[PDB]
Enzyme design. Structure first.
Site, PDB file in Angstrom:
ATOM      1  N   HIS A 156       0.873  -1.237   0.489  1.00  0.00           N
ATOM      2  CA  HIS A 156      -0.244  -0.505   0.312  1.00  0.00           C
ATOM      3  C   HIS A 156       0.634   1.503  -0.049  1.00  0.00           C
ATOM      4  O   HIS A 156       0.394   2.169  -0.940  1.00  0.00           O
ATOM      5  CB  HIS A 156      -0.948  -0.319   1.020  1.00  0.00           C
ATOM      6  CG  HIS A 156      -2.319  -1.579   1.054  1.00  0.00           C
ATOM      7  ND1 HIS A 156      -3.250  -0.929   1.024  1.00  0.00           N
ATOM      8  CD2 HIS A 156      -2.307  -2.271   1.443  1.00  0.00           C
ATOM      9  CE1 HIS A 156      -4.009  -2.095   1.144  1.00  0.00           C
ATOM     10  NE2 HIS A 156      -3.505  -2.822   1.178  1.00  0.00           N
ATOM     11  N   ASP A 362       3.421   9.618  -0.494  1.00  0.00           N
ATOM     12  CA  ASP A 362       2.240   9.086  -0.116  1.00  0.00           C
ATOM     13  C   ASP A 362       1.688   7.625  -1.568  1.00  0.00           C
ATOM     14  O   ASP A 362       2.186   7.620  -2.531  1.00  0.00           O
ATOM     15  CB  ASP A 362       1.218  10.480  -0.297  1.00  0.00           C
ATOM     16  CG  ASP A 362      -0.345   9.412   0.404  1.00  0.00           C
ATOM     17  OD1 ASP A 362       0.084   7.845   0.444  1.00  0.00           O
ATOM     18  OD2 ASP A 362      -0.569   9.802   0.818  1.00  0.00           O
TER      19      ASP A 362
END
Ligand code: NA
Ligand code: NA
Lengths: 459, 471
Positions: A156, A362
């Site tokens: 992720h 991110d």
């Protein structure tokens, strides 16, 4: 059909299974329901001695298999190698990394301990789907126990390029662990290519004509599966929560002033001092905006020392900026260390004119996508987005910024607040089309389809 | 006759030593300047009140030195601005230390444009121009804007970061455009070359043709690695020649038969000097039999320039040395001698030769010539062991080093212990492996191959410039 077995940090319990709670549960629950599957992982509790076996709870077609963690197991999983070394290096903050051999051994140990707990539950054709960097060694531990099941991994967070990955001293062993999966998935093509670059350029393996990777004596499907959202559900929630008391209170306090929304957990990938200072710089560069726009930064509470240090830093920065500019009935920066339910945040997003989402790094950033999906198409807000967020590859209507130029972010905020309706609508519809073409079911369906292809080729 | 080589670099030093044992850019380029009757253009090291109208001209033998002073404003924008506040930290993989500022970046472009205009009036049409290192990256682009069509080459002495890391520099796209203004863009290592190529190809800026040339920004660019070497036989001779100097005798007496680990680094954040000290501490804790039997000498030639960074790093290292010496020292043993001192180059080589371990483990380094100098200094009858960071460019060549990851303090400690006890036969095998590489890529290879590639640019342009009969 074969069961899907989801392996993750935390099994959603109770109210956390509601789709309105978001999280991994909304991503995987349909597949657990379709397959009569199992969700295995931590129950959130600390136990005095290790559990003999997972506790079993069935809700309809889905089984929840949960264990507590001892203090030692918790420390080795959450306060050791994965967060001291892996997380900072993978977020391009390796100046913060601290490698320790004993912590690394503990990381391997807790993964093997949990793999042993899971293995006794498995049927030979279960499809196993492991999530994120705390569990990276999990398939390898299962292979050592003789598990031949299809196993997939989804990362992720970003996967760094080989030059940056090598800041993690056991990088070669970690890449070997990732080749114990039959499917290894990443957020973006750049993450996928970084992994492939490591394998190819270091002579570890080769890409065959079908695109598979042949490495460590195994054949691995390597692909990107960017995680999306459910845009229609988000928009509906944004509307339905628009009269809740927290939304009305902010609406009333603003008195018609414009609103910039920002929502981040507190960690050093987020660049939140920069976030505040570029808003300060905007107000200094364009003082006509003073008294006419406010920044609301929400941070859900969450490493106790890192969280508290950042929170104090940001409280001091917000206090300093507010002391420089604040007027009657105007607070320039409202910094809220509070957990709001997801649907309230969507109503805040819809009310705002700008979504200010500029982390330094991110893996994807779902706030950026939720921000877009919350907007009223008749008057939509503008997303200001870091080019180092995975979502930037998809949200081409955002004002993209390099957060290492504070003036770029200040300029983007001013442009967002001044943007004519027709351009705001063009950018909004451009981003929304991308969100609708890669909604959350795409991640789930394509990854599960690839696990099923492993089993098909196996038979 | 051949075309003049025009060297463009940070500093033209009058009468710098260019004997093969010497160090600096002068020894790398002087043979080519002398051979071509060329010009070395750059700063004279002086500050002036107002900009120099035109460069001063000094001839030494067959070489012309064309120099200007810098104003304080020009000096600050060149040395205390974008190059060192943004480019240098990002290219050394320290994005966390970078501080981008638009006005500093404009100043970087401005001073490059200023210096290029000074050089342009001195050019002849066939001159070969060779620009050195990151402070002068935009120099060719500025020359092109002035109509300069000469062959121009660039050599980057520091690493070139992969695209994901390069993008931490906000004007990365414009910098890469500047780099494509050169006919030849040279790097230390294949990895640096590939990082640049990756940026061009994967971002859709340009393409590699069959011959390996890069086609980008309307130009054809030769992209290659030219790892900088040394003259190893000259270093070894110098080390022996200085073997009887008083400081060498002083150090030997001060060691009292103890083994010696040598480490020589300027103070900057790419060097990992805290890690360097802490791994030595860890070795002494893990292998306490080494206590009182080995000493680490860390030499750090002062670079008061960039005062804040220098003083901060020095304070940190003094505290670490103070702690480690407090932990392990005895009546007649200082574990870490930390010397903020400048020593004659040939003395350092004699120190290297005396030592048993060369401890060269920067966090990131374009090449690291201390590692090569360390090997070259050794007596092959009893040679020291090089412990070398895998993030130093020299690690691609010095395959006989004990290679370590400096972020793994325990691996570094284990490598120090292994180095100190390594049997002679293995030490010699590793030494001769490294020495053979140094001899096959000595400093003349860098000079000769880069100049040859510039001459190839000129020859190709000559070929397309004519189609009619010759001879
Ligand atoms: Na809105
Ligand atoms: Na020696």
């Amino acid at each position: 059909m074969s069961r899907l077995i989801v392996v993750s940090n935390r099994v959603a319990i109770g109210e956390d299974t509601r789709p309105s709670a978001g999280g991994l549960a909304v991503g995987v629950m349909d597949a657990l329901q379709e397959t009569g599957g199992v969700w295995f992982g931590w129950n959130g509790e600390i136990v005095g001695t290790p559990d003999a076996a997972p506790a079993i709870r069935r809700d309809g077609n889905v089984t929840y298999a949960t264990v507590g963690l001892t203090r030692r197991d918790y420390d080795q999983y959450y306060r050791g190698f994965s967060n001291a070394t892996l997380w900072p290096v993978f977020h391009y903050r390796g100046d913060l990394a601290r490698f320790d051999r004993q912590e690394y051994a503990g990381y391997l140990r807790v993964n093997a301990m949990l793999a042993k707990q899971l293995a006794a539950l498995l049927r030979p054709d279960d499809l196993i789907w492991v999530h994120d960097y705390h569990l990276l060694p999990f398939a390898h531990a299962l292979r050592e126990l003789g598990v031949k099941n299809p196993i997939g991994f989804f990362l992720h967070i970003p996967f760094p390029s080989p030059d940056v990955l090598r800041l993690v001293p056991p990088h070669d062993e970690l890449v070997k662990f990732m080749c114990a999966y039959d499917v290894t998935g990443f957020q973006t093509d750049a993450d996928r290519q970084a992994f492939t670059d490591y394998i190819e350029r270091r002579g570890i393996g080769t890409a065959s004509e079908d695109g598979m990777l042949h490495a460590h004596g195994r054949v691995v499907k390597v692909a990107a599966y960017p995680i999306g959202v459910y845009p229609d559900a988000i928009a509906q929630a944004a509307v339905q929560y628009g009269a809740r008391k927290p939304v009305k209170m902010l609406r009333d306090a603003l008195g018609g002033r414009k609103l910039v929304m920002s929502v981040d957990r507190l960690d050093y990938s987020k660049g939140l001092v920069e976030r505040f200072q570029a808003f300060e710089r905007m107000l200094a560069n364009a003082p006509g905006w003073q008294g006419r726009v406010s920044l609301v930064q929400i941070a859900p509470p969450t490493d106790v020392q890192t969280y508290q240090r950042i929170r104090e830093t940001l409280e001091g920065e917000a206090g300093r900026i507010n002391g420089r500019f604040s007027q009657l009935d105007w607070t320039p920066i409202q910094y809220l260390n509070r957990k709001y339910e997801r649907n309230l945040l969507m109503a805040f997003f819809r009310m705002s004119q700008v979504g200010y989402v500029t982390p330094l790094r991110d893996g994807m950033n779902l706030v950026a996508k939720e921000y877009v999906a919350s907007q009223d198409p008749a008057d939509p807000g503008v997303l200001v987005l870091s080019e180092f967020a995975g979502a930037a590859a998809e949200l081409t209507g955002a004002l993209l910024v390099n957060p290492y130029d504070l003036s770029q972010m200040a300029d983007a905020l001013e442009r967002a607040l001044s943007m004519p309706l027709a351009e705001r609508q063009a950018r909004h519809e451009e981003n929304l089309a991308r969100l609708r073409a890669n909604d959350l079911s795409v991640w789930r369906d394509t990854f599960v389809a690839d696990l099923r292809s492993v089993a098909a080729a196996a038979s």
